[PDB]
Design a protein around this ligand. Structure first.
Ligand SMILES: OC[C@H]1O[C@@H](O)[C@@H](O)[C@@H](O)[C@@H]1O
Ligand SMILES: OC[C@H]1O[C@@H](O)[C@@H](O)[C@@H](O)[C@@H]1O
Ligand SMILES: OC[C@H]1O[C@@H](O)[C@@H](O)[C@@H](O)[C@@H]1O
Ligand SMILES: OC[C@H]1O[C@@H](O)[C@@H](O)[C@@H](O)[C@@H]1O
Ligand SMILES: [Ca+2]
Ligand SMILES: [Ca+2]
Ligand SMILES: [Ca+2]
Ligand SMILES: [Ca+2]
Ligand SMILES: [Ca+2]
Ligand SMILES: [Ca+2]
Ligand SMILES: [Ca+2]
Ligand SMILES: [Ca+2]
Lengths: 114, 114, 114, 114
């Protein structure tokens, strides 16, 4: 099944943050309405934040997270969780190799903000 | 925080099912747009299904689950999880006593159907 | 990534219930420690419960859900959610065709029981 | 029900990161085995990261997140989500006022690392 794709309420600000846990340099691309809206690049094996930014879901509300290492797409796992019918978390994990820890690039999207 | 309240897409069919794990008789009430739409009553300490039904979220999409034992409201815990940005689960747990297993009445709402 | 596999606490009773939403007959197989422990078969396009049963996670705690239609494995989506650090839900969705509603066979595993 | 408490596997490294979305200064305290292990303090209404750190769950695996503003405990909401039976997210939201957006202090715990 497709992973890393989330439908957020339209024209809503959200945060996107990425953590790295791999020897390979992680390239995280965030698309809004199928167009790049943010790109984070970094390397860490200690969960360092390689990027964080505030974006707007726009008219479509479509947000997609892509993760690649040296141009090769990583395998993604994702899900959305809503707490008290208000607080949203769009979660993404990714695997660039064979150990399957799926934490090589961890992306967290949260809303609402403010 | 409020628990057991979920905003579903409008006019969408969904399933609601309740399981019981308590000495006390569980009364599960499901409200749609603040009006009763289903009521399940049963007793089991072996996770028996005390009720299952198909409902429609209506114009408001507001769905609220209430659980009580002998007229006394149980304490609720809940959350919504979305898989592959399509499959939805609105989950509710409830505690009628002091052991805090929160499974006395377990309610699962799922959509889409068909 | 692998889906439908969950590690439950050892020797713990859990419930497993399956719902069907497809023209095709759904075959849900539940494995505990890689050995069949339950099999549900049914057909419904109205979220009917095609099976529910209480199982024990055993010494390994490994539980895997398989879904197939006419012998063909469906594509699975899954996740585990824990509420108040006590109530557990192991969720599985499955797609047997091309519309991607992933509800053809919906499986819910819950614990603790009693 | 109690919120903000999570049982992680013993002696496992995990990351904890906090975001702020409130006029009030957020004080996030992380306890491991009931003893303070990290404290973040900051103010932002734009989801700024007020802290991030790597901790070890220790022998007990008990991790608890506390959030307060000017010494007053905020109301918490939380849940744990596991993807592909490997990637873990312990999520916490908090409300310091009356608008109930529960994002005043957002805390994300993730593991495994490396
Ligand atoms: O080479 C990539 C590899 O780097 C290691 O340090 C680990 O983080 C692995 O999970 C990852 O797949
Ligand atoms: O008396 C109510 C009580 O019944 C027991 O059998 C357990 O199921 C408890 O969790 C529940 O609170
Ligand atoms: O033929 C299989 C097909 O049956 C339909 O009724 C729908 O439930 C589809 O989602 C499913 O894939
Ligand atoms: O004064 C506290 C208050 O600050 C505002 O800016 C919002 O972030 C509210 O959600 C928050 O409760
Ligand atoms: Ca890896
Ligand atoms: Ca890794
Ligand atoms: Ca109880
Ligand atoms: Ca009980
Ligand atoms: Ca289908
Ligand atoms: Ca279907
Ligand atoms: Ca607030
Ligand atoms: Ca706020």
């Amino acid at each position: 099944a497709t992973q890393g794709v989330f439908t957020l309420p339209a024209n809503t600000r959200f945060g996107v943050t990425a953590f790295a846990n791999s020897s390979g340099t992680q390239t995280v691309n965030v698309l809004v309405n199928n167009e790049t809206a943010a790109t984070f690049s970094g390397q860490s094996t200690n969960n360092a934040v390689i990027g964080t930014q505030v974006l707007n879901s726009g008219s479509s509300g479509k947000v997609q997270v892509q993760v690649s290492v040296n141009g090769r797409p990583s395998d993604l796992v994702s899900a959305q969780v809503i707490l008290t019918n208000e607080l949203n978390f769009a979660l993404v994990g990714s695997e660039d190799g064979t150990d399957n820890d799926y934490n090589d690039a961890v992306v967290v999207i949260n809303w609402p903000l403010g």
